[model samples]
Target: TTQTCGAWEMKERGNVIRWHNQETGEQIAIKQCRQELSPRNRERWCLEIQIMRRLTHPNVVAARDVPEGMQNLAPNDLPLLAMEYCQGGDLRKYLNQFENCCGLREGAILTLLSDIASALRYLHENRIIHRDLKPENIVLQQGEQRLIHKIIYAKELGTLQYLAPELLEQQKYTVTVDYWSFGTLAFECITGFRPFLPNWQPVQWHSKVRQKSEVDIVVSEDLNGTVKFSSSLPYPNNLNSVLAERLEKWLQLMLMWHPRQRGTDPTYGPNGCFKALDDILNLKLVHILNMVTGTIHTYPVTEDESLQSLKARIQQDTGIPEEDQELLQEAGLALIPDKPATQCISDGKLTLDMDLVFLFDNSKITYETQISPRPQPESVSCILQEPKRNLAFFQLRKVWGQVWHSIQTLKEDCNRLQQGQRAAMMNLLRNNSCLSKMKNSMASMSQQLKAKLDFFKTSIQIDLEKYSEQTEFGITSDKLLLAWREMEQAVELCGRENEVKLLVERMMALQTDIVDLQRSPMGRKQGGTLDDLEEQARELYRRLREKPRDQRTEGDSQEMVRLLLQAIQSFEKKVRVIYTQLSKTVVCKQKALELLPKVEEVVSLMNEDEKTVVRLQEKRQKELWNLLKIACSKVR
Candidate 1:
């Protein structure tokens, strides 16, 4: 039987053509070398052919015998390789069927990754590296149920998108290069684009890859100047968060810059890329359906993930508050938050339905109904035609209306009195007895309202409960009940007698401080020694200047100035006392008069020091102006 060669297709390093056996009607691929065959090149090409012949794997395309007719058709200087033909074409062509930014189905990704991983493992075991591994080199053959991918290894330099940093820098590499290429290919299959060089041109990638100092890229000196990949690589939005995390972890390992770290040394260690891939393949994915919104989300769970952790993830995904989320199995049994997911989720693949029940506080429930009386009396009357019941409902509504008005007035008065108390406390010199009087008046009004609420509840609670049972008066009766409860709460808030007592005590303490300040001899000679007073003034001046600019408020500045002035005045009083003692002891009118001139000079020096203190205070104020001027100039 004769084998006939069909039209040839161009490849990266060679041309591939189909060969058909005339008698058997079977086809195979014939790849012919296109490079010039120097002696050295021919020797390497022969070694590659030998390696291809020795390797055998289901996912690795096997070399076949070249028929004599095809061998004669090839040129004598160049060599031709006969291999199994993959009729379904390459991965690049398969990926083209999907839309931009859309990845292959999950099953397809798993199958493709597993097949390529098996091929790479087998090749690595045989001590052969697929130097050029890319989408085009991964050929797909149509099987009975699915597409089976077969890898075709090459000896030429790989495509830049899948080239490792070590290879780009022209350093010697090992089998880890294949792992890096596989990672890039897997990323493209999951995300529909390469991670680093998606939009880069060939020349740009060549330059950037060699330089090794770009965004998302870092050079590591610890590993002998190898480049390190950034951990913050972008992921596909459509993927489940847990699955994406697992995939990202695997990619991180596979794409490590150090060749030894890429996982083939101890050969598939626990932390190796291969182990990570196995974990990804074995991930337990569960579907969650939001019962409220009618949305289904898929999430990956581990054996250690608790029901609470799942709910937290659900909260993150659906924006439902964690406390409000209720997770139930497909059989409608609720999942306990503290238990592990495996204990409740027996199948591991169950679609748990989520129900959101918002929590309502008692005060919030009261406040919501306080704004407007829901289920208007007219609607209630329309629902119930009983005249007697309608009259009772109107009576209840009238009582609640009065109570609500009083509740609002009490709340407003309480707020006003609290504000007035705060203002009185801030301005300590103000007459604060007005706050006490306002509190007393509000307390009496609150006491009267409390009495009215108590009377209303005792008289009408039984009747309201009776109406509350009937569907017609349910809303109105409930609103009245809530309003009565709210009135009691408001009255309790307004009549906070203990809080008012504490405020009064605090004010009395402040009054005691004021009395002490007035009674003390601050500027008199008996206050302190002149040296002590002078030291106190200098200390105050130092603190006023050295305090943090942002913390120095106008009130703080004024208080510091007042204390310093008091100390200075006390120092002057001590100086005058000394002058009086000296004048009496001298017993000479002329000498006393000469001493008066010296005292006048000392007084002048004290005045200059006081002026210096004033100037220092003004300088602090001017510092703020300087800051504003700098800011304005910068803006201009």
Candidate 2:
């Protein structure tokens, strides 16, 4: 029957043993007093049981009924007190695992302080003083279901290292003695060492504790009697600066030499230590990464703080000006200046552990994630109007395109006519009869070309003025106006009316001279035979016809013009020689008759070329106009 349940294991220090329940598997710890207790000792034990029975908090160890078999293990009159077993053991053993100079994590320190402070507050409210609160007296109860470590208070007699100055002086002390002990425990948890050296005598500690002069606290593993000590506590390097400062303030109040001056300051309300611990517990740790320095700073902040206030606090600490500092969330999204810190953080579903980057230099900020505001109704209306504006712009561009095409055609016609005129003049000089007819034809073509150009210029000017008057298109209208101006300039440059007039006059003069030459010349044949002159004229005609005509470049046209002029000069000279040598008018008449038919053919060819050019220009103009019409209809 005894082997069915686990055996009771004796504890190392106390007269206590623990065993697991056979059925429920709950561990139970029982403390055995002396077999024969005196009446005074019996009364003290009974009072302790009543006190333990009165306590009922998560952080306080609960008393359990002793097992039936263990009731008479001691004297039947003596009580065997049982308690809820704590498998995690005392906090001293937990702290021993972190034997390095580094102390517990900030989170762990806060948790320990919070749990212990809560229990102590409950005890003081119930008119009970723990009287001996130390790491050993604080037990950890880690459960499987709730994976959190909970600190439980197990009653103790005061230890020398954690005892208050009043207690050390053997003076009557109040509940503030526990505050001093809590301060020492908190200091040890943060720095991994006690405020006062444990090796010091009680009197030495009492004297050392009273010296509250300003000095740097140094903590080293190696210590000697010659080593100097400071009144202040040494905080760990990893602790947040804001948290460290607040904790230091808390420690100062808890460890005050005067009992009344300890944790009962009126500024912190009736229970100052409880309020201080609650404040520390509620603080959120914020890590701010300084983009300029490439270093991170940790600060404790209230969740309800405004972003503007946070920026100001950051400025004060970093020496960065408030106006220059820009706070960005972890995702590089900037926080709104007027929004609360908690709202911005929770809106993004971000935790307090996320870094808030501080950009001190605005110029160095490469990219920003802007949270755009909701679009207004007016802006939405503008978006809806985009298609109409685009249609208007398209119509304008179409009209401009038609105008540009017409201008280009006019320019090409001017260039072709100019070149054709020289060739036409050469043909005119070779024959005397067709001279007047060719002149009339050339004049008509020039006037028609000029008229077409004038019409295009007028149409462009009218459209430009119409579009310019309508300012609803904004930039598109300005661009259209600019395009019209450029087209107008191009039209002006394309005008060859003056050159055509001059060429017509030159043709008339040549026609008059040829008429005179044909009527008056009756000299004898001179220079060479008519066959020789004919051969030279035929050769020149062959060369001109053989010149590349299709897609002719400026150089080709120039060369053709040069050759035509040379052939005209040679023919004119031969005609002069024949006039000087001709003895009969019949010889000149025969030669004139031979060239008149050829000149008529050349004039016919020139008329055909002009007709083709006009036809092409008309077709292109009609197509462009149709496109413009369709675009305009769409805009309407």
Candidate 3:
């Protein structure tokens, strides 16, 4: 399967396949980037995935190693592109494996709730947002302790119905989008269908997505005619009053229209804390559950009980491990139980505990899949048959729909040739119809893919409110999502075994491709005179560098920087140059465009470092402004 799933590999060595390390032992998901694409494409890909690899979480699949190996499937001329493979068949398949009804499993959904939330909490804390946080990205591996496999790849995706209004506005993307997406995902637990179901066929959810402004998540009990939100959102006691209230609250908070409205205050920094997301609403707190026994009227710790005092008292309660008890503050999770009410327990019904677990993606919890909120040991189910079947069906339909729609929709997209292109006809070609048609076709295909990618960016998150949970996905597969890691993992170190090698080779090839595209084809591809634009870039950089040109020459250090930045500003001049050229390159144009920014990095860092003295003054102004905005799904 790993061989057949070679295209799925992220990076590979001669034989040692590099993959996400979901578990401790032999069972792992290896991403085979060896034969997926050309060498040039792979490296460019490596850059993109590597930036993503810095992402972390207990239940999410973070990059474990650099991509590996090289495959020259095509002769010397064609390039290669490698892909990151999470051995697990993404969350979409994982959910379809269970018919998309795992939400009702009580145990599974409970676990999922915690894992996803924790992952988001960590990502937000780290200023990262997996814009695409869908079922497919939620990779999974069997949880050894709970017997439930957790998710591995927490690829960015947002909730279908849960998308924040800001993201749709095309204004600013934010990590808060993940929280909104999580709310929509919560509703999909039983395949009840996305609340804002598109009117088109069950398939083409994406097609219709492009045509809409916002989700219609309100449900109406009037099953007959039309359905819409009620007058003021009545408390119908539909799911269960206790959970419904909490769920509604979570949905509202996570999907707030504005990123600033989403409440995420990482007191200890993103990587420092753990949130809870488990569904054992009551199994926990047996220590506290005893108070519900009625023998003792209210929940009680020992006579001299305080969280701090009880922590000391737990030393005498026996060897169950206060750490394992999960309620300990030192355990890195924020769990506080509700004070007992005077209400009596009828038929042993326990007032559910609102301790949602949030599993964060981190380097330590290096799991291939970011699946989380795995059921506690006390809630394992040997019978995964129905759940598995459900997951399989959902995935089959979803995959089929996406693939089929891509082809059909290709016939329709516009915005061809990317906004503007020179209308000049070929100087030598007598018949230009074919060329014109080709340009239209290429634009259409690219447009459709872009649309799907955008939709995917928003529909992946559905478990954000639940991130506060930690015990479940915590200590699990986690990585440290840091921007500095991106700087360190840059193109310099490309020769390591396994993953790094593939990335290096791939990046070099893309550089070559971009270089070729930049040259005038009539001139020697390798030895062209830079088409004179190089001089222009230098002149600009030089002007910015000096009050007066010392030599009046372009290509100076300052001129180069100034040029790249100017190119970024001259949207037309730059976009035209790239569009005309990139179509010929195998790597995505979006990537080649990235070069300017990487160059800008050197400039920004120098500027920032120079002002390091204004540390706190800067933090108070910058942190909050930069923190809440993001959605990594849209990153690509």
Candidate 4:
């Protein structure tokens, strides 16, 4: 029997008299699954052999021969695979017995990275992502660092925390994920911590890829920015430089939002992997901490033969293509250099203010038998819905203020969107608000129009009956309802666009709260107590209750729409921050991940039966749409 990577067993003569391959003078270990038993086992064996036969590498366990094993070897026509016997046992047991030595020193870590990178490149070349890269899967032969047996056999390998982000977002697998595994390996080396080292951050999103909420990826608060090494020396800036630089470039190459941008092949070769490897290896940045204090200028390496050309490297201005011109306009750009899209964000506002129209049809009403007027009949206030409209206006103002403040909580990077950057934050806020307001205005208009439709239902039928013989262009209650519904529907559709914004706000608030708690010790410590935190929670609830209701105003439609739109924009900013920060925390090991569960708890308190809300919103929009049509056209 051939030596096995795991336990040793001897078998021969194709399962006959001698327990060895008598003819070939060879001994083979028992295979994974034998076909003699059941069809299911036979199928499993077949698949294992197929996959094993294809894997070829010095480090990889190779399948050398497949002889038909009948009876014991098998009463089987199916081939028996002969594999190289790895003398060493499983990597995990070996490490336990002999102490894992992957991180004894700098050179050791470098060698390990080198070996793993090579193996990764090899597997990627064959279009196979090992998915799982860990110390246990690496079987060592005595003290051999590189050559080893395959642990867990050839089953599809993966460990969640080591996965890449793009794999989660796009579901396209790539070698860049292997780099992430390597990163995890680096952490494990020093502290002997496994990937997904359990601390406060819950393992619900253990997989590095799709950590559903942004909460799990962040570092624990106790260790925030204070990771200490056993040695007294400061944490290695060298590794940090390499990591920061490599992660940025590799993230782009591997986890591109669009796969096409990453390049032609999903499977990467040594050239592709090393392209990044070499880039990191050759990073020539002068370390700021290591620099001499006084002499500012430093000489370039004598061996470096490159020279800068006199000509300007930047390209000259050219006209945008006709096809792209409209795209630029949509992007808020104008036709001149001075009128770039950035200008809108930087200084100017788009002239697209929101438009909301409320229709209050004072439908004429008449009782068939006039119940004699007893005392002065109190007038139903219906000259116009102006007072109700103003109340809606007040609600809208408060909504806008709250939403604007909510957006201010986004954790913007200090570099690009810093305070006193070229553009003011207010500029971005106002424009975004305007865009949202327009959508809300449309929804409000739809609501008001729906009321008109309701009025027409009561009055139009009577009018049609009374004027039946008079005119050919006669109107009925059903016809008016249909017309009103059509127009209402149009308005409702206009409102749907702001939907993306609303989801953003709801999700963002929680994430922002988490990040804030992580960053602010005072907030976190104080927030831990029920008395203090409960009061804040109560305030939040109070804000919710403060929204005005019941009264229908003259301009209520427009104002409500404006508020809704502003709320949506606020949500957009919040969610984007949450999602991005969550991903970063996972990758960089930030403290914010710890607060996710509590954050989730806060979000859970919202009581927004999400599915129900979506369904109701859809139904309302549809009803409004139908109402608009009734008010406007008949055929619609």
Using TM-score as the measure, which candidate wins?
2
User: Tens digits of per-residue lDDT for model 4 on 1-636?
Assistant: 434222223544343222255456554444543345777766766877787688877656566664443334443677666665455654445323212211223334444555556666677676656655666556555435344335322234434545544454445555555555555555545323333433324343334223322222222211122321121111211133344444334433443223344422234543364556554544332211100010111111122322121001100112222332211122222224322112223123321101100011111121121111111101111112232443333343333233222222121111111111112222223344443454354445445444544544444345336445533454334444454345344334322224434544543553444344244221122212322333343344345445567533324334333433443344444334433432332222222233334334433432233333344446645754665577568664
Cα lDDT of model 2 by residue, 586-630, tens digit? 233344445445445544654564464455446545744665686
Backbone clashes, candidate 2: 6
lDDT (Cα) of model 3: 0.36
Residue 214 of model 1, lDDT score: 29
Against the unseen true structure, what C-alpha lDDT does each candidate score?
A: 0.50, 0.53, 0.36, 0.37
Q: Relative to the unseen true structure, what is the C-alpha lDDT of residue 166 in candidate 4, on a scale of 0 to 100? A: 44
TM-score of 2: 0.52
lDDT score for residue 537 of model 1: 42
Q: Candidates ranked by lDDT, best first?
A: 2, 1, 4, 3
Worst 10 residues of 4 by lDDT: 352-361
Flag the better candidate by lDDT, 2 or 3. Answer: 2
Candidate 1 lDDT by residue in tens digits, 1-636: 323344332232236666566667657677677656688878888888787777778887888887655555666555677888777788887665513234565667888877877677767667677776778878888878668998763553326767765565677867777777777777767655566554456666656554543233222221122234555434322355566666666666666655676654244673266655776777777765443333346677777877676777777877777775645442224455566555324334321122211111111111110112112223223223332222232232222222222222223222222222222222322333433354355445435544644554454455445544554732232333454344334333322335435544544554454344232222233533433543454454445445675755432123323443454455344334333322222222122233334334433443454444345335534643564476568768
Give the Cα RMSD of candidate 1: 37.8
For 333-434, candidate 3 gives per-residue lDDT tens digits of: 234644432122323433122221111111121112111111211001211112222222223233222222222122111111121111111211212233
